[PDB]
C-alpha cells in the first residue's frame, strides 16, 4: 500500500480511472467538432474557436483527476481514448446539441462518482468533485442549452444566415 | 554571362519572367474588382478594401520575383499586362469565385515553376518558391473558399442583405 | 471535390490522417510518463514537468496537421488513441529511453510522409513537413539522447541520487 | 444557551475542543523537530526552517478552530499540550517519517470529526472541515511522502551527503 493512502476505497480509485478516460474522450469529441468548423465548406471560425477551447478545458479536467489519483495514493491506469461518434457534425446547431448531450453524460458520471464517494464516506473526494467539477458542469450545460435555444429561435439549421450571425455575435 | 550566375538554367530564367507577368496580371484583376465595389450602385466598401489589399500584395509578389531574377543573374523581360476578363463583376459572391479561380491558376503556374526547378536541380529556386509563394497561395485559396462558402450559406447573390452583412462582419 | 483542393493526392490525405493519430498517441505516452513521476513513490517533479510539456507539444503537432488537412481540402478522419505500452515506467532513465524510441518512431513516420509527398510532387506538403516537423524531431531526439547519456554516466538507474540530481540540475 | 447557537450538537462542540488540542500538539511536535535540526551536531538549516513553518501552520489551524467554536456558540475548553514523543529525532529521514505519521493521525481525527458532523446533520461544520482542513491534510501528506521517498532513494539515513543535498535542493 502507498505510504500516503488513507480512507481511499479501491472502488473510488477505479472510478477515478474511468472518469479520467471519459474526460479525455470529451476532449477528443470537442477537438473533432472544432476542426469540422474549420473546413472550407463549413467555415465558421468562432464555432471552431469555441469548441477548441472546450477541448482544452476537458484535458485540464482529466489532468486534475490524474493529480488527484496520485495525491490520494491510487494508481493511474489508462485505456484507449475512443474516437468520437461522428466524423461529420452536420451544422452548428447539431454540434451544440451533441455537446449538450456529452456534457450531461459526463455530469451523470460525476454524480455517480460522488454517490460512490458518499457511500464510502470519503468527504475529501466528495469536496473535490463538488469544488472542481459539479458547478463547472452545471454552467457548461446551461451555456450549451442557451446556445441551442438561440440557434433554434434564429432559424437554424436551415438558415445558414442564422449560423453565420450567431458565430459573429455570440461566439465572437 | 552574368558574373553572379550559377546553376540557373535559361528555362528557369524564362519561367520567372512569365511568372512576373502573371503576378502583375493578378494585381490588375484585383484592382478592377476593388473599384467595382466602390461604384455607387454596388457600394460595398469592405469588399473594395479587401480586393485593393489583395491587389497590392500581388504587386509585391511580382517585385520579389524581379529581385530574384537579378539576384541569380537572369535578365528581366517584361510583357504587356492584359486587362482583366470582366469589366462588371456582378456580385460579391461572383467576385470571390473569380478570385478563387485566379489564385488556383497562379498556384498551378507556381507548381509548374517548382517542377522545372526540380528538373534542373535548382534547390535555391525550389526554396524560394516554397518559402515565399506556396504557403501564401494555400492560405489565400483557403480564405477565398471560406468566403465563398459563407456568402452561399447566407443566401448570396440573391440576398443583397447577405452581401451587406458579410461586408460588415467578415471584411470589416 | 473540395473547392480548395489542388495537387493533393488521396494517398497524402490518408497519410496525414495517420500522422494525426500518431502525434496524439505520442501526446498520450508523454502524459502517462509525466504522472508516473508525480507518484509519491517516485517523486521527481521536474521529470513530471518535462514530460507534461512534451505531451502538450505533441498535441500542438497534431492540431497543426488537422489545420493542414483542411487547408489543402482533405477530410479529417480520426481513430482511437491507443493507450501507451507501459503503465509503470520504472525509472527516469527508462522513461527517457522510451521517449527516445518514441521520437525516432515518429521521425520515421514523418520521413515516410515526406517521401510520399516527394513521390507525388507535392512541394507545399514537403515544405510543411520540413519547416514544422523535421528539425523539431532532430532537436528532440538529440536532447533525449543527451539526457540518456548524462543519466547513464551519473550512475542511473541504480543510483537514486543520480536521478534526483539530474532532476534538479538539468530538468529544473 | 448561547444566543447564536443553532444546529450545533454538544458532541460536535466537544470534538472541536479535542481537535484544538491535537492541532496544538502537532504544532509542538514540529517545533521540537525544527530545533533538533538547528543543533550544532545536526546542522541542517533548511530542515529547521521547513519544520518551523509547519509548526506555525499548525497553530493557525488551532486558532481557526477556536474561532469556529465561538462562531457557533460553543465554549472553548483547553487541556495540557503534551510534549512530543521524542527529544532526539535521529535524522532528516526519521523526522520526515514521524511528520508523515503525525499528519495521517491528524487526518484520521478530522475524518472522525466530519463523520460526527454528518451523523448530526451539521452541513456548516462539514463544509468548514472540507474547505479548510481536508485538502490541506491531503497535500501535506503527499508532500511528506514525496520527501521520504527522495531521502530513501538518495541513500538516507546512512548518507549524510544525501541529507545535506536534499536540505539544499528541495528544502532550500
Ligand atoms: Cl485506504
Ligand atoms: Cl478498499
Ligand atoms: Cl476506462
Ligand atoms: Cl484499452
Ligand atoms: Cl472497446
Ligand atoms: Cl456522449
Ligand atoms: Cl458501499
Ligand atoms: Cl462522508
Ligand atoms: Cl450559468
Ligand atoms: Cl455560478
Ligand atoms: Cl446563447
Ligand atoms: Cl447583424
Ligand atoms: Cl548558370
Ligand atoms: Cl542553361
Ligand atoms: Cl509573359
Ligand atoms: Cl507584350
Ligand atoms: Cl496577346
Ligand atoms: Cl484566372
Ligand atoms: Cl529537364
Ligand atoms: Cl534539387
Ligand atoms: Cl489558412
Ligand atoms: Cl499556415
Ligand atoms: Cl469566411
Ligand atoms: Cl487534387
Ligand atoms: Cl488522388
Ligand atoms: Cl490512424
Ligand atoms: Cl478506431
Ligand atoms: Cl486495433
Ligand atoms: Cl514508440
Ligand atoms: Cl508514386
Ligand atoms: Cl516536388
Ligand atoms: Cl539540438
Ligand atoms: Cl537547430
Ligand atoms: Cl542532457
Ligand atoms: Cl444547537
Ligand atoms: Cl446537543
Ligand atoms: Cl483534549
Ligand atoms: Cl489537561
Ligand atoms: Cl494525561
Ligand atoms: Cl502522531
Ligand atoms: Cl448520531
Ligand atoms: Cl448534513
Ligand atoms: Cl499535492
Ligand atoms: Cl490540490
Ligand atoms: Cl520531495
Ligand atoms: Fe467551457
Ligand atoms: Fe475556459
Ligand atoms: Fe470535463
Ligand atoms: Fe465538459
Ligand atoms: Fe492576401
Ligand atoms: Fe497583407
Ligand atoms: Fe501572387
Ligand atoms: Fe494571389
Ligand atoms: Fe520538446
Ligand atoms: Fe516547448
Ligand atoms: Fe510530434
Ligand atoms: Fe515528439
Ligand atoms: Fe547542486
Ligand atoms: Fe504545510
Ligand atoms: Fe505555509
Ligand atoms: Fe493541522
Ligand atoms: Fe498538519
Ligand atoms: Fe457534503
Ligand atoms: Fe464545499
Ligand atoms: Mg468510460
Ligand atoms: Mg471503435
Ligand atoms: Mg469507512
Ligand atoms: Mg464552487
Ligand atoms: Mg502568362
Ligand atoms: Mg485583349
Ligand atoms: Mg545540373
Ligand atoms: Mg514557410
Ligand atoms: Mg498509426
Ligand atoms: Mg489495446
Ligand atoms: Mg503530379
Ligand atoms: Mg526551419
Ligand atoms: Mg487528543
Ligand atoms: Mg507525559
Ligand atoms: Mg438534527
Ligand atoms: Mg477547497
List descriptors.
part of a larger assembly, 4 chains, 172 residues, mainly alpha, Ferritin, binds chloride ion, binds fe (ii) ion, binds magnesium ion
The pair of chains with the biggest contact is:
A-C, 32 and 32 residues
Bound ligands, named by name, code or SMILES: chloride ion, fe (ii) ion, magnesium ion
For the record, the count of structural domains of chain A works out to 1
Query: Which oligomeric form is depicted?
Result: part of a larger assembly
Order of secondary-structure elements of chain A? HHHHH
| Main structural class of chain A | mainly alpha
Radius of gyration of chain A: 18 Å
Biggest sheet features of chain A: none
Helix content of chain A: over 70%
Name given to the CATH homologous superfamily of chain A: Ferritin, core subunit, four-helix bundle
For this structure, what is the CATH class of chain A? Mainly Alpha
Strand content of chain A: under 5%
Catalytic activity (chains A, B, C, D): 4 Fe(2+) + O2 + 4 H(+) = 4 Fe(3+) + 2 H2O
Enzyme class (chains A, B, C, D): oxidoreductase
Protein name (chains A, B, C, D): Ferritin heavy chain
Pfam family, one (chains A, B, C, D): Ferritin
3D architecture notes:
- This is part of a larger assembly, with four copies of chain A (172 residues).
- With 172 residues, the first copy, chain A, is an all-alpha fold.
- The first copy, chain A, has one domain: Ferritin, core subunit, four-helix bundle (Ferritin), CATH 1.20.1260.
- The first copy, chain A, has five helices and no strands.
- Chain A is elongated, with a radius of gyration of 18 Å.
- Chain A starts with 9 loop residues before the first helix and ends with a helix.
- The relative contact order of chain A is 0.16.
- Chains A and D meet through helix 4 of A and helix 3 and helix 4 of D.
- One chloride ion (CL) binds next to helix 1 of chain B.
- Chains A, B, C, D: Belongs to the ferritin family.
Amino acid at each position: 500500500t502507498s505510504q500516503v493512502r488513507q480512507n481511499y476505497h479501491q472502488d473510488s480509485e477505479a472510478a477515478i480511472n474511468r472518469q479520467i478516460n471519459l474526460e479525455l474522450y470529451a476532449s477528443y469529441v470537442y477537438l473533432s467538432m472544432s476542426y469540422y468548423f474549420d473546413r472550407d465548406d463549413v467555415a465558421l471560425k468562432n464555432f471552431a474557436k469555441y469548441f477548441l477551447h472546450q477541448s482544452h478545458e476537458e484535458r485540464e479536467h482529466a489532468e486534475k483527476l490524474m493529480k488527484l489519483q496520485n495525491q490520494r495514493g491510487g494508481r493511474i491506469f489508462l485505456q484507449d481514448i475512443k474516437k468520437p461518434d461522428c466524423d461529420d457534425w452536420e451544422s452548428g446547431l447539431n454540434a451544440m446539441e451533441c455537446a449538450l448531450h456529452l456534457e450531461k453524460n459526463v455530469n451523470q458520471s460525476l454524480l455517480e462518482l460522488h454517490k460512490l464517494a458518499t457511500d464510502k464516506n470519503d468527504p475529501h473526494l466528495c469536496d473535490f468533485i463538488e469544488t472542481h467539477y459539479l458547478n463547472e458542469q452545471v454552467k457548461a450545460i446551461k451555456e450549451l442549452g442557451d446556445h441551442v435555444t438561440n440557434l433554434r429561435k434564429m432559424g437554424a439549421p436551415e438558415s445558414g444566415l442564422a449560423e453565420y450571425l450567431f458565430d459573429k455575435h455570440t461566439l465572437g
